[model samples]
Target: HQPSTYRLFYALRVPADITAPLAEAQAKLRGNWRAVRPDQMHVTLSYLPAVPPERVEDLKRLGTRLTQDLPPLHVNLRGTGYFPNEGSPRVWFVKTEAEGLTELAENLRAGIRELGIGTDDLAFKAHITLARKKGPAPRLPPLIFDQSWTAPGLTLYRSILRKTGPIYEVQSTFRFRGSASQ
Candidate 1:
């Protein structure tokens, strides 16, 4: 069971080569800034804020149904940007050329909403969150990472929250049949 009730989240696993450079970038910004570890970085497709445990099966079913028509996504992580601004920033993350990911996310969201699952407030943007601010936004340095290619896959994830951090485990995965699923 998760702390804030359980929710369904769809995300693409990050490859280690990209994660290594991400870890180095975080190290460069490691002062008072609380940054996300490379191991935790991911591009979230959709979130169902909270759903009942009894409905977990329903989540997995919907995930597979919506993804049946989903094509393999071509994605490339690139650039560096902040939430608020360069001088005073709240969050830092890389831009992803993965609008197709966004489209799939929208499809997933629509499918979940049909099931009466929780709706997402924010417009789905495909980007990996690097960290959150502690207090008084830090004047951090620019985060730079080399581009990384990815063929994003779809999955249903069980997010377990602990005192230390959140633990994620894949509940089920379905890939485009003709693609790497081979």
Candidate 2:
């Protein structure tokens, strides 16, 4: 096999109800706007850029260790926003009001560091990324929909990018210790 770089991220899957409202909003936007697939919608906890093969093994170990003993995340997906500003938007997203969501992101960063992997110290704002702008016409209207759910586990995913869109493939999933999958 060829040596390859992995675009890995840890995320919590959003509830399915979010799809309709987002679809409606996306339908209104015509140019250079690509809405994320329903199955691809997730709140990113930690995004690791282009990780190598050996480091990926280390991350898999970290995923289990960090997930253990942590309780499930209670998430409320609400409101919407964009990167930069609406006047010059590059990315559009729905806000997350989840208990322990930020903490989980911080903890995941810490765990990655413990494995001797590098971590970017960017401030994390919990959000569900909905779409990305390719060129012009990023006129996404505000989306107002409320959905809540318990994320019982952490999923390590490898995001593959192609012409169509990014495909998020599940690498591994680690459940919170003693938490039942609901």
Candidate 3:
């Protein structure tokens, strides 16, 4: 018998208002890159490729506890860059930096370890993916993008892939306590 698994991650969900403009920004790029939908945009803090389904609830509890004392986050999404520069870039993304982003990601990673869930060994680089290359190498134009918003909450999301694209479903949301501005 095969073990049932869940594809999950902890992230800051992007609202439509922010994503709409990002999609517009994507329209300005030149390449055969697939543009991500506005609703699907998010800042991933931690990703678990697959996990035993039963532990999902455990993860939710951990996320809630981890976020209880943290204040809301104000993030500035700025600039852009491509992965594996010097050649055809596979992923084009917008960079993100915030007062609490790194701290939040670290806390979530620690919680993942505490839960005995497998987490990615790669370091977290805060960015929202704008698009991904779909064809042969193409020259990319200079990227310029800027935006800001207050994160509503840290969310536990389940990823379901389809022919159209990946669909993200919110399994849990941990709202930050206390009002904070940065």
Candidate 4:
């Protein structure tokens, strides 16, 4: 019998301070899409499509090991962009700048690959999804906001699909080496 699996991914949980500004920007956009809630905002690192239930423990162990020596990430979310093109956008997102985010993601991807978990060929572009396209793209208003936060750790989330949207449940969390000030 096939082992049960869950749609899993690693991400930096957005703090309320940043999420509030993100939500405010989303309201300004006023596009033909569904706005993401502030509570669900995140900066994804690796998206694991399916993982066997038995391997959950192994995955958590890997995360703990990888994050052991990592320092807290300083993240800045600013501006706005969209998938496809501005003329015919499909997804609206908030652009981000962060120290060590790319490096961290690269390390996580390599670790996951070594474990024979999965592979992602696409280059990683860091951003927080603001909305998903529901119909033709509308003329989105210009968005400009600078919100900064210190991400304390990475979290493994199980994404459960629903008619309304995806529900994310935290399976495990791995803290960085130093405190948020570091």
In candidate 1, what are the lDDT values of residues 76-178, reduced to their tens digit? 8777777755455677787776645666777878877887888565776677778767557445566555566655457777788878788787878867443
| Residue lDDT tens for model 3, 124-159 | 789998888856645557666567888868999999
Model 4 Cα lDDT, one tens digit per residue, 1-182? 67777899999999888888788777765647888888788988899887888888888998998888778788888788888664567788988888778988899999888888964435788889888776674667768676798888899999998887889999999998854355
Off by over 4 Å in 4: 85-87, 119-121, 179-182
Can you list the residue pairs that collide in candidate 2?
Answer: none
Model 2 gets an lDDT of: 0.78
lDDT of each prediction vs. the true structure? 0.72, 0.78, 0.84, 0.83
Better of 1 and 4 by TM-score: 4
Better of 2 and 3 by lDDT: 3
Ranked candidates, highest lDDT first: 3, 4, 2, 1
**lDDT value for model 3:** 0.84
Model 4 scores what on Cα lDDT?
0.83
* Best candidate according to TM-score: 3
lDDT of 2 by residue, 74-146 (tens): 7887888888654668788888887667877888988887777665445788887777886788475667776
Quote each prediction's TM-score. 0.83, 0.85, 0.91, 0.90
